Amino acid sequence: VQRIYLDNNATTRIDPKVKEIMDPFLRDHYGNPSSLHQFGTETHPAIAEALDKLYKGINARDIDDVIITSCATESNNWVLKGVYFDECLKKGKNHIVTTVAEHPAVRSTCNFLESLGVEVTYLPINEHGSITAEQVREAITEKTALVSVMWANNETGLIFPIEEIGAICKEKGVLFHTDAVQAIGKIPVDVLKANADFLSFSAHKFHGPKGIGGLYIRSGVGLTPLFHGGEHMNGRRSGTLNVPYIVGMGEAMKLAVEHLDYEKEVVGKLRDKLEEALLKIPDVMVVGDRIHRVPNTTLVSVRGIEGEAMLWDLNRSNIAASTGSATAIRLSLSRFNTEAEIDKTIEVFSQAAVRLRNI
Amino acid sequence: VQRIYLDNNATTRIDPKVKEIMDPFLRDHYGNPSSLHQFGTETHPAIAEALDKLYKGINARDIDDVIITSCATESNNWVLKGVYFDECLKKGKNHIVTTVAEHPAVRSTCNFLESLGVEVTYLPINEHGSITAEQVREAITEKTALVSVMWANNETGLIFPIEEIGAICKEKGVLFHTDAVQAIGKIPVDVLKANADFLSFSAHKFHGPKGIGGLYIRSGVGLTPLFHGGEHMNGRRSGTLNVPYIVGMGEAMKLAVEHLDYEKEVVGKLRDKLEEALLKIPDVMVVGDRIHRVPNTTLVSVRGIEGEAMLWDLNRSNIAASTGSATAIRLSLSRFNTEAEIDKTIEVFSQAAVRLRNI
Ligand SMILES: Cc1ncc(COP(=O)(O)O)c(CN[C@@H](C)C(=O)O)c1O
Ligand SMILES: Cc1ncc(COP(=O)(O)O)c(CN[C@@H](C)C(=O)O)c1O
Ligand SMILES: [Cl-]
Ligand SMILES: [Cl-]
């Protein structure tokens, strides 16, 4: 069989080059980076080069941190629970501003915070699919400790106006976190433009392994550790480093960035091909704005069918994809897809479409 | 060159079989276990078999949890910070009992807890190297929320009387966590014998990859998540699973347990060989008790030399090891060592010994 993968916002294949680069750290460079002897020191250089790659991915300066984590969910829980202790409790700054769009790691953590007594406002989503900036402007109180808005949306592919949000946040004196998980490798990411104080990502959205990610922390911004024990990552996050996955994720980030133009021109073109082909069906509205999306995503709906039903049929034709908020169907490409696979999807989708209608 | 690795309590080589089993999950079974389509469902079976292996390693029942984490430091921070919220805050049970022996993840987290207002008593270590049980008996107040004692000590290899501690904890109504990181693969581990409510481990102490670990949670014991977001691990710890490392760590645990007798009879014998050979030097006292140690560790001191100096010289002779509390030298074997390598160490150590004395 010839299977087609269109669920890249759920996770992604590890790049062959990523696999190849981690391999010697599963084989004989197994030493613990903290060890003082050769087994440890010999991992130094590769670690350093990984970190360089991460820095250059997100336009982070020497004086900033990019801390390695076990995934974006760790990152996001760290940021929220750290600012709770540093701001909400110790500074009485008892309010967080976020959106209804956010990943559940963010939203569940916020919920928990409310349980303890933080007030969290959850910004509503507009007709244009997006949040405005002015919406955050108008929410930022005296008490506001942090604003958290995701860079791009995992369900619709919509880019939020981070940066404008950056500015509104600078002007008003407030901590700014952006969850940038679905922006890496998909559009350029620049914490400087963004005035991020905090930024999250996870390798497996850009062809590294599941099980690692980063939190960008800006210079001189405190954030009480989520993993105390304090020896690794300048005491910001304790635990023996995941050497192999570090090295992998370096590589991934690099390749991700190198492919920005390819993502834009080629993958985006593929997405468009697909999109147009599918709008030719009947009442197949696309979902949300079409102009401010990451290149690789399209969330279509289909008049009289469930998303789940569509998905299940697609699966039997060896095509993988997932749902989103109405349900609707999310098709999420990557550089690994080809025009052949799109064409095929167009066929198998339309057949499936026609074939499920009468029920 | 022929290098000799004796720093197994710092980390360990991934077993070839562990490497081999994770490999297809870095290659083409890259789907996200949550996905509903084949790419996801096809990871189901291997995940399940991994989990089975983990269960059987630690004598955990079906109705218990073994939750996958990013490492033992995650585990330990989870346990302490969860019981703070479930017990210290919500039940007014404002005291934790632990030892001075514990890993810094435990101790730093405790320190942080104190910062917020928990009272933590830190049980002092005795002349016999160990903690008694009666010592915990006598500390358990009305207010005591949790007792945390490590199963074996990473610095000395000393086994604490967990189980007796289990009983004293059952009788008095108190939550029992044991950090068992250095017991996996080294002596049998049995949460049932132990009345653990919580038990930690990390794969890289038993020849799986760094960057994953477990928290055993006993049936019906709550523990407010450290990673909110709640979709993975029955909502106890959110984040896309580390499929490859799961599968690896399964395998590791299995092999670890299969090798218990080999660890006892062969590795322990090797350790003894080494130990005796080195006691023949001059005022080379061994450090702590010699009778209740995991098979693989020995912490020697050397009359007139620093530990660091000894280590550095050893490193130049291609032998890897680390220090411990007075400083002293820790030599930590695994099944991968051979009598040849010991012999060699005996030589290179004694030469180094004699050669560093006059200064
Ligand atoms: C924007 C965003 N933030 C955070 C996460 C969580 O990353 P980890 O699971 O690596 O912590 C994801 C992945 N989500 C999946 C569940 C999806 O979109 O289908 C995401 O898309
Ligand atoms: C008893 C114990 N608990 C917890 C940990 C932390 O595990 P992770 O780093 O996998 O979270 C270790 C490893 N320690 C090293 C630093 C040593 O003994 O030399 C340990 O020995
Ligand atoms: Cl915290
Ligand atoms: Cl928590």
Answer with the one of A216, A239, A259 that is the final residue of a domain.
Answer: A259
B168 inside domain: yes
**Joined tokens for residue B199:** 């038990």
Provide, as residue numbers in chain B, all residues whose Cβ is less than 8 Å from the Cβ of A321.
37
Same domain for A182 and A55, yes or no, is: yes
> Among residues B212, B235, B259, which one ends one of the domains?
B259
Smallest Cβ–Cβ distance between A240 and the set B37, B204, B240 belongs to B204
Last residue of a domain, one of A227, A259, A291: A259
Kindly determine whether residue B240 and residue A311, on different chains, have CB atoms separated by under 8 Å: no
Of B238, B296, B247, B209, which Cα lies nearest the Cα of B54? B247
Other Cβ atoms less than 10 A from the Cβ of A116: the count is 11
In the block, residue with structure tokens 């084949």? B38
Q: In this structure, how many other beta carbons lie within 10 angstroms of the beta carbon of residue A310? A: 22
- Listed in sequence order, the residues at least 6 apart from B278 whose beta carbon sits closer than 8 Å to its beta carbon are B284, B298, B300, B346, B349, B350
Instruction: Please name the residues in contact with A282: beta carbons below 8 A apart, sequence gap of 6 or more.
Output: A303
Mark whether B162 and B99 lie in a shared domain: yes
Residues B270 and B250 in one domain: no
Q: Sort out which chain B residues have CB atoms less than 8 A from A204's CB and list them.
A: 32, 240
User: Is there a single domain that holds both residue A1 and residue A40?
Assistant: no
Q: How many domains does chain B have?
A: 2
| C-alpha span between A169 and A194 (Å, rounded) | 10
Q: Using the structure block, give the residue that is written with the tokens 């980063």.
A: A214
Q: Domain limits at A54?
A: 15-259
Residues 6 or more apart in contact with residue A6 via CB below 8 angstroms: A319, A320, A321, A331, A332, A333, A337, A341, A345
Closest chain B residue to the Cα of A203, Cα to Cα:
B240
Exposed (0-12), middle (13-18) or buried (19+): which is B340, by Cβ within 10 Å?
exposed
CA of residue A111 relative to chain centroid, distance: 20
Residue entry with tokens 């599918």? A278
Shared domain for B91 and B186, answered yes or no, is yes
Which residues in chain B touch residue A312, judged by CB atoms under 8 angstroms apart?
36
Assess whether the C-beta atom of A242 lies below 6 angstroms from ligand 1. no
Same domain, A209 and A147: yes
**Tokens 């010991």 identify what position?**
B342
Nearest-angstrom CA–CA distance, B214 and B65: 10
CB nearest B73 (choices: A105, A238, A321): A238
Q: Are A237 and A274 contained in the same domain? A: no
Neighbours of B318 (CB within 10 A): 15
Instruction: Give the chain A residue nearest B75 (alpha carbons).
Output: A227
Minimum-distance ligand to the CA of A36? 2
Paired tokens of B60: 């955990």
Cβ atoms of A26 and B14 within 8 Å: the answer is: yes
Q: How far apart are CA A202 and CA B220, in angstroms?
A: 32
- Do A311 and B242 count as a contact with CB atoms less than 8 A apart? no
Q: Does A3 touch chain B (CB under 8 A)?
A: yes
Closest by CA position to A132, among listed A160, A101, A102 = A160
State the CATH number of the domain containing residue B181.
3.40.640.10
Residue type, A80: L
Measured N-to-C along each axis, helices A44-58 and A243-258 cross at an angle, to the nearest 10 degrees, of 40
Q: Coil, strand or helix: which one is A329?
A: strand
| Pair (A155, A174) in one structural domain | yes
Do residues B95 and B123 touch, judged by C-beta distance below 8 A? no
